Amino acid sequence: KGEWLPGLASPDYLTGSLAGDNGFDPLGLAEDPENLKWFVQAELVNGRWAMLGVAGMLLPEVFTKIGIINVPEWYDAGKEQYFASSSTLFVIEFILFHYVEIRRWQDIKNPGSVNQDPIFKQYSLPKGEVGYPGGIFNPLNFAPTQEAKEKELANGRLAMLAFLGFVVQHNVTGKGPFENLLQHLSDPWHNTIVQTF
Amino acid sequence: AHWMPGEPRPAYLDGSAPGDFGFDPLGLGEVPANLERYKESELIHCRWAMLAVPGILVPEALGYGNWVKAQEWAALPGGQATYLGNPVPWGTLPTILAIEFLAIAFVEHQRSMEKDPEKKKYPGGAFDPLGYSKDPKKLEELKVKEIKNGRLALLAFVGFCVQQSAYPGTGPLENLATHLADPWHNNIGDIVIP
Amino acid sequence: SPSIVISLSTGLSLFLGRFVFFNFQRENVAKQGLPEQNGKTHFEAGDDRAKEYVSLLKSNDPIGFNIVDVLAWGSIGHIVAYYILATSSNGYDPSFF
Amino acid sequence: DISGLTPCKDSKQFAKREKQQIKKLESSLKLYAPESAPALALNAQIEKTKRRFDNYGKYGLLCGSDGLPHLIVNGDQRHWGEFITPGILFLYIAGWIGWVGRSYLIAISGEKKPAMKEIIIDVPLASRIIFRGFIWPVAAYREFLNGDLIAK
Ligand code: CLA
Ligand SMILES: CC(/C=C/C=C(C)/C=C/[C@@]12O[C@]1(C)C[C@@H](O)CC2(C)C)=C\C=C\C=C(C)\C=C\C=C(C)\C=C\[C@@]12O[C@]1(C)C[C@@H](O)CC2(C)C
Ligand SMILES: CC1=C(/C=C/C(C)=C/C=C/C(C)=C/C=C/C=C(C)/C=C/C=C(C)/C=C/C2=C(C)CCCC2(C)C)C(C)(C)CCC1
Ligand SMILES: CCCCCCCCCCCCO[C@@H]1O[C@H](CO)[C@@H](O[C@H]2O[C@H](CO)[C@@H](O)[C@H](O)[C@H]2O)[C@H](O)[C@H]1O
């Protein structure tokens, strides 16, 4: 497909068949097909989680700054007292995620092997590609076209970069993301990173 | 009926034996003699745990304390045992230990003198008076039920031991009562992370 | 009473040896034969002092009980009895082990 | 706190040692004229000593009875920065160097006479190889999983 850096030949192993292909691999990680498949799945999951994380730490801050719901900040959301102790929630999350991730791992190892429901035997997932289960996971029945996959990959990459920026710019400056953006917009030439220290 | 869908079964475990679900990640049973010995030992362990669990559970439901406290009297000098609330005249450490050693050694040696590989696990005859083992159709089902119940009993005994280690001087029943008192604060979480 | 304990322990050990563990001991001693050097027994190699005392082990008991078995089981019983006596003599208290 | 050790801000021998060092420096400082460069150098030395002692007090080390700081390599969470973090950094750097060297050796093994390439290094190939060490743990893990790490 496209070239990430003009004037540079794309790597031979990247043929453009994969969605979201731009030939960006200067360090030679995906020189083996098995590594390519594993890293494709890893890039899907890391980024499918990142989009949700970025939305969760972005939208409530905006809606609170508007003045509709008062919500604690994403860094201070752990100190608040909830209906249950953090340990019980962690244990429940650990068990459920153990189950679902072991199911996904068994799907990755042997494709089309864990499609069948273990309890109600009459229900099974339709056959498809790895990483896109479909079926019940696609309740609205949207076609898994290549353009949609490219859009999803681009959005995931942007979300990963945004999460990294959130973490770094909250570590350096004690304020949150939206207030940092507002402060920068107040005076663009005297509020950048180089102005600080 | 595998222990994990999509995981290939080992060659030596095909599913003919009762309770055969193809679980052997470490491959400890490749040698047939080792497999036979492991089967016999597993059956013995399952039967022992199945007999032991009600013995732990029936006390602490009545006025008596628990399984751990019932062993305390031997540590104190001149201690005497009790049963159902009545002291036993012949309750003292040396005589009790001697009788237990003699009887258990005799019965274990008599069990071990058997030569037939099948009889070492399912002897039959004078050990089953009711006669449920005559019909071959129900024998496999009964063996499967026994194996599953024995595995559950072993897991229960491990749970009992770990619960006692977590809460010294505490019984399983009072642990269940404490958990039922407030299910959202008294869990394994506060012990896992301190 | 030392006599009662000694007699009880010795009798129980002799009864256990004669009636219970006789076959196991015979089978195990048959499995591991005489010590051998370079594939031959110590007497076959040329050592006259390593000759088995066949006459001593012969006995008229129906099952084959001989003097050596009596000595071994009596020694075990006496060791057990004197351990019991010595341990019961003193007043050591573990105090919650 | 640990093994009968005293926090370095509390201990008195630390301040005594600082006093001895400052007095020893001032003894030589008194000789030269105030405007002379040696006086400025000695004043800078005194300031450096004071800053070093202040930083050592701040970082929370534990001096012993003799008044010198001690290092804890147990793994206690209060003293992870003394040993564990520099250890991780050193392991990362050493793995980088080893991976780069092994990659260059494997790359030049193909030619007919690798000895002339070893005695006379080629710069473009080494420059291309060097920057691949930034991701050495992932590559090593994947090669171990595949089975290309160990020769047969
Ligand atoms: C090219 C990189 C290289 C690598 C990856 C290894 C790898 C190894 N060495 Mg070898 N070694 C090397 C060079 C290298 N060596 C050189 C140059 C010498 C001569 C000084 C030795 C002499 C040597 C000895 C005497 C021993 C090892 C041992 C070991 C093993 C354990 C690690 C260790 O103890 O380090 C020990 C490391 C050193 C003594 C010095 C090596 C570091 C040098 C200075 C740098 C190598 C970098 C190289 C110049 C990079 C050029 C590439 C560039 C042009 C792109 C391990 C297989 C040990 C063993 O046998 O374990 C089983 C051991 O006993 N090595
Ligand atoms: C998953 C992820 C973030 C997940 C965030 C989550 C779950 C957040 C959860 C919460 O916020 C909520 C919702 C609400 C809060 O109350 C609580 C918390 C818990 C805080 C980020 C991934 C972030 C991932 C990132 C940034 C990855 C970057 C990778 C890069 C740049 C790689 C580059 C290269 O590899 C290439 C592509 C090719 C090679 O040739 C060259 C090199 C250079 C090696
Ligand atoms: C005749 C007869 C009979 C009988 C028999 C008998 C009765 C026998 C006995 C026997 C015996 C009865 C024996 C014994 C033995 C013993 C021994 C052998 C011992 C030993 C010992 C020891 C060795 C010791 C040691 C010591 C010391 C010295 C010191 C201290 C310490 C001790 C203790 C260690 C009958 C009827 C049956 C039958 C018929 C015939
Ligand atoms: C310092 C610690 C160790 C101390 C060891 C002391 C050992 C003292 C041994 C003294 C002698 C023992 O008794 C000795 O036994 C041997 C058998 O074993 C007898 O027999 C020996 O001589 C006869 C006659 O020539 C030979 O046929 C025979 O092969 C030989 O072994 C001896 O005739 C006898 O005298």
Total residues belonging to chain A: 197
Q: What is the 3-state secondary structure (H, E, C) of B109-142?
A: HHHHCCCCCCCCCCCCHHHCCCCCCCCHHHHHHH
Total residues belonging to chain D: 152
Distances (CA, A) of D130 to A30, D102, D116: 17, 11, 20
Long-range contacts of D81-85 (CB under 8 A, 24+ apart): none
In DSSP terms, A124 is beta-bridged to A116
Residue D135's closest CA among D103, D106, D110? D103
Strands D69-70 and D62-63: antiparallel
In DSSP terms, D142 is beta-bridged to none
Whether A88 sits inside 8 A of B184 (CB atoms) is yes
Say if ligand 4 is within 6 A of residue C46 CB. no
Rounded to whole angstroms, how far apart are CA atoms B7 and B23? 10
With H, G, I as helix, E, B as strand and everything else as coil, classify residue D7. strand
Residue B39's closest CA among B9, B12, B59? B12
Dihedral angle, C-alpha C30, C35, C37, C43, nearest 10 °: -100
Share of chain D residues as helix, strand and coil, in percent rounded to the nearest 5: 65, 5, 30
Q: After which residues, if any, is chain C broken (C to N > 2.5 Å)?
A: none
Residue C85: closest C-alpha in chain B: B94
DSSP-H helix ranges across C20-96? 22-31, 42-45, 54-57, 67-89
Helices D80-108 and D123-130 pack at an angle, to 10 degrees, of 140
Rounded to whole angstroms, how far apart are CA atoms A51 and A63? 18
Note whether A183 contacts B: Cβ–Cβ < 8 A.
no
Residue B187: closest C-alpha in chain A: A88
Cβ contacts (< 8 Å) between B189 and chain A: which residues? Answer: 85-88, 90-91
Rounded to whole angstroms, how far apart are CA atoms B19 and B41? 14
The alpha carbons of chain D give a radius of gyration, in whole angstroms, of 26
Q: Whose structure tokens read 């498949």?
A: A37
With H, G, I as helix, E, B as strand and everything else as coil, classify residue C62. coil
Whether D146 sits inside 8 A of A27 (CB atoms) is no
Rounded to whole angstroms, how far apart are CA atoms C79 and C76? 5
Sort D11 into a burial class: Cβ within 10 Å, 0-12 / 13-18 / 19+: buried
Q: Which residue type, as a one-letter code, is found at position B35?
A: L
In sign, the C-alpha dihedral spanning D55, D60, D62, D65 is positive
Rounded to whole angstroms, how far apart are CA atoms A78 and A75? 7
The alpha carbons of chain A give a radius of gyration, in whole angstroms, of 21
b/e B38-53 (16+ beta carbons within 10 angstroms → b): ebeebbeebeebbebb
In DSSP terms, C41 is beta-bridged to C36
CB atoms within 10 A of CB B150: 20
Residue B192: closest C-alpha in chain A: A87
Atom 15 of ligand 4 has which residue's CA nearest to it?
C49
In DSSP terms, D7 is beta-bridged to D62
Instruction: Check if the beta carbon of residue B47 is closer than 8 Å to that of residue B154.
Output: no
Distances (CA, A) of D81 to B145, D71, D74, D84: 56, 10, 12, 6
Residue A166's closest CA among A65, A72, A55, A54? A54
Rounded to whole angstroms, how far apart are CA atoms C69 and A2? 93
CA atoms lying within 13 Å on the CB side of residue D48: 7
Rounded to whole angstroms, how far apart are CA atoms B29 and A75? 52
Instruction: Chain C: list its partners (3+ Cβ pairs within 8 Å).
Output: B
Instruction: Check if the beta carbon of residue B21 is closer than 8 Å to that of residue B3.
Output: yes
Strands of the sheet containing D62-63, edge to edge, are D6-7, D62-63, D69-70
Sort C50 into a burial class: Cβ within 10 Å, 0-12 / 13-18 / 19+: middle
Instruction: Check if the beta carbon of residue C53 is closer than 8 Å to that of residue C67.
Output: no
Instruction: Check if the beta carbon of residue A115 is closer than 8 Å to that of residue A125.
Output: yes
Interface with A, mutate which of D129, D135, D142, D146 (most A CBs under 10 A): D142
With H, G, I as helix, E, B as strand and everything else as coil, classify residue D18. helix
Could you give the angle at the alpha carbon of B46 between the alpha carbons of B45 and B49, nearest 5°? 85
Instruction: Check if the beta carbon of residue B115 is closer than 8 Å to that of residue B12.
Output: no
Q: After which residues, if any, is chain A broken (C to N > 2.5 Å)?
A: none
Rounded to whole angstroms, how far apart are CA atoms D150 and A16? 33
Say if ligand 3 is within 6 A of residue C10 CB. yes
Instruction: Check if the beta carbon of residue B48 is closer than 8 Å to that of residue B26.
Output: no
With H, G, I as helix, E, B as strand and everything else as coil, classify residue C96. coil
Rounded to whole angstroms, how far apart are CA atoms B173 and B164? 11
CA of C4 to the centre of ligand 3 (A): 14
**Structure solved using which method?**
cryo-EM
Give the ligand at the shortest distance from the Cα of C18. 3
Note whether B33 contacts C: Cβ–Cβ < 8 A.
no
Dihedral angle, C-alpha B98, B99, B101, B105, nearest 10 °: 140
Residues annotated in a binding site of B for chlorophyll b: 3, 47, 88, 108, 111
Q: What is the 3-state secondary structure (H, E, C) of chain A?
A: CCCCCCCCCCCCCCCCCCCCCCCCCCCCCCCCHHHHHHHHHHHHHHHHHHHHHHHHHHHHHHHHHHCCCCCCCCCCCCCCCCCCCHHHHHHHHHHHHHHHHHHHHHHHHCCCCCCECCCCCCCECCCCCCCCCCHHHCCCCCCCCHHHHHHHHHHHHHHHHHHHHHHHHHHHCCCCHHHHHHHHHHCHHHCCCCCCC
Strands B82-83 and B86-87: antiparallel
Rounded to whole angstroms, how far apart are CA atoms D53 and B57? 64
Whether D132 sits inside 8 A of A27 (CB atoms) is yes
Quick one: tokens of D86?
């520099």
Q: Which residue type, as a one-letter code, is found at position C31?
A: K
Interface residues on C facing B, Cβ-Cβ cutoff 8 A: 12, 16, 20-21, 23-24, 84, 88, 91, 93-94, 96-97
Rounded to whole angstroms, how far apart are CA atoms A104 and B151? 28
Rounded to whole angstroms, how far apart are CA atoms A136 and A132? 11
CA of D140 to the centre of ligand 1 (A): 17
Residue D129's closest CA among D101, D92, D93, D98? D101
Residue A106: closest C-alpha in chain B: B6
Q: After which residues, if any, is chain B broken (C to N > 2.5 Å)?
A: none
Quick one: tokens of D106?
């494997």
Phi then psi for residue B35, to 5 deg, are -65, -40
Transcribe chain B into DSSP letters.
--SSTTPPPPSS--S-STT-----TT-TT-SHHHHHHHHHHHHHHHHHHHHHHHHHHSTTTSSS--TTGGGGGGTSTT---EETTEE-TT--HHHHHHHHHHHHHHHHHHHHT---TTTTT---GGG-SS-TTS-HHHHHHHHHHHHHHHHHHHHHHHHHHHHHHHSTT--HHHHHHHHHH-TTTSSSHHHH--
Q: What is the DSSP-derived secondary structure letter of residue D10? A: T
CB atoms within 10 A of CB C19: 11
Residues annotated in a binding site of B for chlorophyll a: 23, 42, 45, 84, 145-146, 149, 151, 163, 179
Quick one: tokens of A178?
């939206």
Instruction: Check if the beta carbon of residue A51 is closer than 8 Å to that of residue A155.
Output: yes
Distances (CA, A) of B114 to B108, B118, B124, C18, D149: 11, 10, 13, 20, 52
**Which of B77, B94, B102 lies at the smallest CB-CB distance from C84?**
B94
Phi-psi region at D2: left, alpha or beta (left = phi > 0; alpha = psi -120 to 50): beta
- Answer yes or no: is A24 a known binding residue: yes
In sign, the C-alpha dihedral spanning D28, D29, D32, D36 is positive
- Answer yes or no: is A195 a known binding residue: no
Instruction: Check if the beta carbon of residue D65 is closer than 8 Å to that of residue D51.
Output: no
Sort D137 into a burial class: Cβ within 10 Å, 0-12 / 13-18 / 19+: middle
Cβ contacts (< 8 Å) between A117 and chain B: which residues? Answer: none
Q: Which residue type, as a one-letter code, is found at position B16?
A: S
Helices A146-172 and A177-186 pack at an angle, to 10 degrees, of 80
Strands C40-41 and D69-70: unpaired
Quick one: tokens of B129?
């008076």
Could you give the angle at the alpha carbon of B153 between the alpha carbons of B151 and B155, nearest 5°? 70
Q: Whose structure tokens read 């036979």?
A: B36
Transcribe D48-101 into DSSP letters.
HHHHHHHHHHHTT-EE-SSS-EE---S--GGGHHHHHHHHHHHHHHHHHHHHHH
Residue B157's closest CA among B77, B53, B86, B69? B53
Quick one: tokens of A107?
């799907």
Whether B109 sits inside 8 A of C20 (CB atoms) is yes
Rounded to whole angstroms, how far apart are CA atoms A107 and A44? 15
Rounded to whole angstroms, how far apart are CA atoms D90 and A63? 46
